[PDB]
Ligand binder design. Structure first.
Ligand SMILES: [Cl-]
Ligand SMILES: [Cl-]
Lengths: 136, 6, 138, 6
C-alpha cells in the first residue's frame, strides 16, 4: 500500500524547473533541477527514483509531460502504476542560496536539510523504518 | 522506438 | 559501518560514470557525469548524502579530490574522507544498452536491475540497505 | 568563495 506510494510535482525558481518526488507516508523527498519539463526528462527522473526505492505507484499532475510515450514506457518497465512541500523546499533553498553559485547545488543542500532535520525522527529515518517494516 | 527516445 | 560508502569511477563510450556502493549491503547509486572534476564529484556526493545517512566515503584519492570542492561538500554534509562491482554493473548495462538511446538511461536501468535482483527468502541490495539502516536507527 | 565554485 502506502509504503510504495510517491507523489511527483514540479516547481519553478530562477526560470529553472525542479521536480520533487515525495514519499507520501514519511514526507522524505528527492528533488532535482532538470533542463526542461518534458516527458523524456521526467521519465529519466522517475527511472532514477525507481532504482533507489521500491516505488509502486506515483501520483502526478497529469499535464503535458505525461500525455506522450516516454514516461509511460519508463513506468511500464519499472513496474510503476500511474503544494506545502514545494513552499517548504523553497523556504530552505532561499536560506542556503547564497552559499552556492548554482541553483542545482542549493536544491541538493535543501533536500539534505529537509530529509535530516529532527521533527523524534527525521524524514530519512521515517522512510527507512516504514519500508523495513513492510519487508515482512 | 527506444525507451527514452523514438 | 551502516554509514560507510565507497565511491569509484568507471568509463564507457567515452563517458564518465560515478558509482557509490554502500559497503555493508552492496546497494549502488550511479550516474553518468559530464566530467571527472572536483565540482561534479562534489555535486554527486551532496546528492547521495541527502538521500542516505552517509558518515564515511572511501574514494580513490585522485585528481578530483585534491582541490577544495569535494572537501567543502563533505565538511558541510558531515562526511569523513569491487572492481568486480564496476564489472558487474557494466555487464548489466551491456544487457540493456540497445533498449535506450542514451547511455545515461541504460545506466539507470542497470542500477534498477542491480538493486532489485533477488539472488534466491534471500533479499535484494535495496532490501538489505533499508534493513541495515533501520536496525541501526533504533 | 562558494561551496561549488570560487
Ligand atoms: Cl511535472
Ligand atoms: Cl572518482
Amino acid at each position: 500500500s502506502s509504503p510504495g506510494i510517491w507523489q511527483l510535482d514540479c516547481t519553478h525558481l530562477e526560470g529553472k524547473v525542479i521536480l520533487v518526488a515525495v514519499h507520501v507516508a514519511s514526507g522524505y523527498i528527492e528533488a532535482e533541477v532538470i533542463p526542461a519539463e518534458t516527458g523524456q526528462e521526467t521519465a529519466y527522473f522517475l527511472l532514477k527514483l525507481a532504482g533507489r526505492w521500491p516505488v509502486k505507484t506515483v501520483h502526478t499532475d497529469n499535464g503535458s509531460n505525461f500525455t506522450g510515450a516516454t514516461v509511460r514506457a519508463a513506468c511500464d518497465w519499472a513496474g510503476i502504476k500511474q503544494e506545502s512541500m514545494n513552499k517548504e523546499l523553497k523556504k530552505i533553498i532561499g536560506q542556503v542560496r547564497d552559499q552556492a553559485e548554482h541553483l542545482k547545488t542549493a536544491v541538493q543542500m535543501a533536500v539534505f536539510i529537509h530529509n535530516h532535520k529532527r521533527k523524534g525522527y527525521s524524514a530519512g529515518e521515517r522512510i527507512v523504518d516504514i519500508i523495513a517494516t513492510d519487508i515482512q | 522506438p527506444k525507451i527514452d527516445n523514438x
